[PDB]
Amino acid sequence: SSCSEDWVGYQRKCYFISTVKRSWTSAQNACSEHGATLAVIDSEKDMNFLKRYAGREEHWVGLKKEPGHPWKWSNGKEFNNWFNVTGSDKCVFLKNTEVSSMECEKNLYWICNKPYK
Amino acid sequence: SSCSEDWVGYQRKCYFISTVKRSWTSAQNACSEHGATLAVIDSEKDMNFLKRYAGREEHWVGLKKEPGHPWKWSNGKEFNNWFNVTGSDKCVFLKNTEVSSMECEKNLYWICNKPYK
């Protein structure tokens, strides 16, 4: 099986959606304990699936920026800005209707992803 | 690997969500053209995933009953009634907030599934 039990496989990545809310950093730490990271979004398909999978509630995904620095993925890779992040905060979240920023310390559900096995 | 390109894998089933609306029957045939069937739901996990994946819009799933007979799955097998179908129609649909019945002739988006490869 390309993905573990309880994980969702789509476009060569395995996704997990949280059942509890935590800070961005805590969510990132939770994801890392399962070989994953806060959701990295490589394409329009990933984005549409994620907004939909997320649903009405806001969910932390793997994009955040340090003061005076470009957005960086949760796994370190550079962001090519193929999509726009609204708001003026430094951590990115999304839901079925938007992709925006929020204060990183806010407790939100989250979504992790990692490559297929 | 477990599911083909553009399908979503979860709890051993591959899912596909429509881009257009159609009658329940037309939906079943479309699913059929891809070796699948209108979404069979065997557990609360399956249901919770389908409802959120479906989103705000109503989507047809694999339950239909012919007057005089009991509900049956899109693939012909018997329904164990582990859950209750509300409303008063012969075709089941679902969305992020509910799962009920509706006139089979209505044109709704749909969701198919099939077993892992």
Swiss-Prot record, chains A, B:
Glycans are attached at residue 84. Induction: By antigens, mitogens or activators of PKC on the surface of T and B-lymphocytes. By interaction of IL-2 with the p75 IL-2R on the surface of NK cells. Residues 1-117 are extracellular. Keywords: Cell membrane, Disulfide bond, Glycoprotein, Lectin, Membrane, Phosphoprotein, Receptor, Signal-anchor, Transmembrane, Transmembrane helix. The chain holds residues 83 to 199 of 199 of the full protein. It is a single-pass type II membrane protein. The keyword Transit peptide does not apply. This is Early activation antigen CD69. Homodimer; disulfide-linked. Interacts with S100A8 and S100A9. Interacts with galactin-1/LGALS1. Interacts with S1PR1; this interaction mediates S1PR1 degradation. It is found in: Cell membrane. It comes from Homo sapiens. The keyword Repressor does not apply. The gene is CD69. Disulfide bonds join 3-14, 31-112, 91-104. Expressed on the surface of activated T-cells, B-cells, natural killer cells, neutrophils, eosinophils, epidermal Langerhans cells and platelets. One of its GO terms (biological process) is negative regulation of T cell migration. Constitutive Ser/Thr phosphorylation in both mature thymocytes and activated T-lymphocytes. One of its GO terms (cellular component) is plasma membrane. Transmembrane protein expressed mainly on T-cells resident in mucosa that plays an essential role in immune cell homeostasis. Rapidly expressed on the surface of platelets, T-lymphocytes and NK cells upon activation by various stimuli, such as antigen recognition or cytokine signaling, stimulates different signaling pathways in different cell types. Negatively regulates Th17 cell differentiation through its carbohydrate dependent interaction with galectin-1/LGALS1 present on immature dendritic cells. GO terms for molecular function: carbohydrate binding; identical protein binding; molecular sequestering activity; transmembrane signaling receptor activity. Residues 10-113 form the C-type lectin domain.
